[PDB]
Amino acid sequence: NTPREVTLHFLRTAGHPLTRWALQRQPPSPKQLEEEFLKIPSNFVSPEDLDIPGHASKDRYKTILPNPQSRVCLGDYINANYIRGYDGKEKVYIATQGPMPNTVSDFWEMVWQEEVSLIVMLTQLRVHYWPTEEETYGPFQIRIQDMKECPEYTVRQLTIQYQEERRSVKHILFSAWPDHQTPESAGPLLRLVAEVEEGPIVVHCSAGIGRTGCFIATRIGCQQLKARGEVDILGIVCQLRLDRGGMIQTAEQYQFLHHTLALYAGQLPEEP
Numbered sequence: 001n002t003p004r005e006v007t008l009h010f011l012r013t014a015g016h017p018l019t020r021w022a023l024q025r026q027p028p029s030p031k032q033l034e035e036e037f038l039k040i041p042s043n044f045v046s047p048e049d050l051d052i053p054g055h056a057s058k059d060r061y062k063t064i065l066p067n068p069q070s071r072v073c074l075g076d077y078i079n080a081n082y083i084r085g086y087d088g089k090e091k092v093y094i095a096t097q098g099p100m101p102n103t104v105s106d107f108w109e110m111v112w113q114e115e116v117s118l119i120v121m122l123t124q125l126r127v128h129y130w131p132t133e134e135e136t137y138g139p140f141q142i143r144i145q146d147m148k149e150c151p152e153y154t155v156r157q158l159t160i161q162y163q164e165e166r167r168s169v170k171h172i173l174f175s176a177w178p179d180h181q182t183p184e185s186a187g188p189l190l191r192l193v194a195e196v197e198e199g200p201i202v203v204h205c206s207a208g209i210g211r212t213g214c215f216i217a218t219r220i221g222c223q224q225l226k227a228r229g230e231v232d233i234l235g236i237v238c239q240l241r242l243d244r245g246g247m248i249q250t251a252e253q254y255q256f257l258h259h260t261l262a263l264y265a266g267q268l269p270e271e272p
Contacts, residue, residue, distance in 0.1 A: 007041040007043060008043075008242075010039075010040075010041060010238070011040075011041065011043065011238045011239075011241055011242045012238070012242070014039075014040070014234055014235060014238045015232050015234055015235040015238075016028075016036065016232060016233065016234040016235070017230050017231065017232035017235070018230065018231055018232070018233070019229070019230055020225060020229045020230060020231075020265050023225075023231060023258070023261060023262050023265055024262050024265050024266060027258055027262065028258075030255060033251065033254060033255050033258065034251045034255075036234060036254075037237075037251045037254045038251070040234070040237060040238065040241065041241070042241070042245055042246050043067070043241045043242065043245040043246070044063065044064075044065070044245035044246055045065040045066070045067055045068070045245055047062065047065065049068075050065055050066075050068060052076075052077055054077075055077045055079075057102065058077055058078065058079060058100065058102065058103050058106070059079045059097070060079075060097050060098075060100060060206065060207065061097075061207055064079070064097070064207050064208070064209060064245075064246065065079070065245070066078075066079050066080055066081045066244065067081055067243065067244055067245060070082045070083070070243045070244065072094055072096070072110060072114070074106055074109050074110060074113065075113050077106075078096065078103065078106045078107070078110055079096060079097045079103075079208070080094055080095065080096035080097075080110060080208075081094070081095055081096075081243055081244040082094060082200065082243060083095050083200075083203075083216060083240060083243045083244060084239055084240075084242075084243055085219075085220060085223075086219075086220050086223040086224070086227075088239070091200050092200060092201065093200055093201045093202070093203055093216055094110070094114060094116070094200045094201070094202050094203070095203050095204065095208050095209070095212045095213070095216065095243075095244050095247070096110070096202060096203075096204045096208050096212075097204060097206065097207060097208040098121070098123075098127070098204050098205060098206050098208070099127060099129045099204075100127070101127055104127075104129045104137050105137050105138035105140075107129055108129070108137050108138065108140045108142070108160065109138070109140070110202075111160065111169065111202060112140060112160060112162055112167070114199055114200050115167075115199030115200075116169065116199055116200060116201070116202050117167065117168065117169055117170065117199060118169065118170050118172075118196065118201045118202065119169060119170070119171045119172070119201075119202040119203075119204075120172050120174065120192070120196060120201065120202070120203045120204070120215060121171070121172065121173045121174065121204060121205070122174045122177050122203070122204070122205040122211040122212065122215055123173065123174065123175055123177065123205060123206075124175060124176065124177055124178040124179065125175040125176070130142060130144070130156065130158065130171060131143075131144065132144070139162055139163075140160055140161065140162050141160070141161040141162075142158055142159070142160055142161075143158060143159050143161075144156055144157065144158045145157040145158055145159060145168075146158075150191075151188065152174060152175065152176045152183075152188035152191075152192070153172055153173055153174045153175060153176075153188070153191075153192055153195070154172070154173045154175070155170070155171075155172055155195065156170075156171040156172070156173070157170060157171075158170075158171055170198070172192065172195055172196070174188075174189075174192055174215075176188060177205070177211050179205075179206060179210070179211070180210060180249060180250060181252075181253075182214070182252060182253055182256040183256075186256070186259055186260040186263045187263070189215075189218065189260055190218075190222075190260065190263060190264060190267070192215075193215075193218060193219055193222055196219065203215055203216060208244075209244065209245070209246040209247050209248075209249060210246075210248065210249030210250070210253065211253075212247070213237075213240055213244075213246070213247030213248035213249070213253075214248055214253050214256070214257060216240060216247070217233070217236045217237055217240060217247070217248060217257055218257060218260050218261065218264075220236050220239075221233060221236060221257065221260075221261045221264070222261065222264045224236075225261065225264055225265055225268070226268065231261055233254075233257060233258060233261070237254070
């Protein structure tokens with residue numbers, strides 16, 4: 001399997017760092033961005049190359065599996081992967097599918113064991129793993145402390161209890177992102193990112209690759225732009241594809257990412 005290695009070598013070495021100026025005022029044409037995206041290999045796991053018995057009914061999709069090297073382990077199985085963050089720092093995010101009815105307890109177990117304090121949900125409005133007030137999911141009790149509704153997202157303050165310990169989690173539900181698509185504008189997305197700046201950050205959407213991939217690539221991109229005044233979007237996407245196959249689904253989603261980040265640049269505090 002040299003083909004696996006050609007694929008992995010690309011992911012590790014590809015890069016197109018853009019200056020802030022270039023990103024804002026002279027972006028790569030839409031066609032240039034498609035081409036660039038199309039060269040990015042998927043890095044999906046084969047069902048045969050995962051070899052962990054009876055995992056099938058805890059995935060929502062048969063073709064969307066957690067990469068083994070980065071797989072999260074319930075200390076059995078959950079469709080989830082550790083994701084590297086800014087500068088490659090390990091474990092800044094856990095990307096995961098939205099829970100299934102039989103994977104709800106596992107999800108909370110993961111949140112506990114990995115010491116999660118922040119959960120971002122990306123969906124589009126009209127399964128609930130969190131109650132209206134309180135309930136128990138296996139050995140964990142969840143109680144909501146606080147709910148504040150915003151335009152595009154709802155901020156739920158909650159606690160989790162296991163045996164005789166209690167932890168606070170912030171839960172954010174973004175509700176204006178249609179599957180396989182992008183939000184109509186980028187502002188609300190940036191506000192959500194700003195909300196995330198207040199153990200690993202759980203991020204999920206139905207499959208846990210398309211929108212989950214876009215959100216995370218947006219955080220890191222913003223981090224890059226704030227720190228260095230440059231962003232390497234290609235590289236960011238390569239890095240994610242290394243941690244979980246298929247992060248960022250469509251060319252369009254990738255175009256929007258450049259857009260989301262041009263807006264971040266333009267909105268960084270300056271002086272008139």
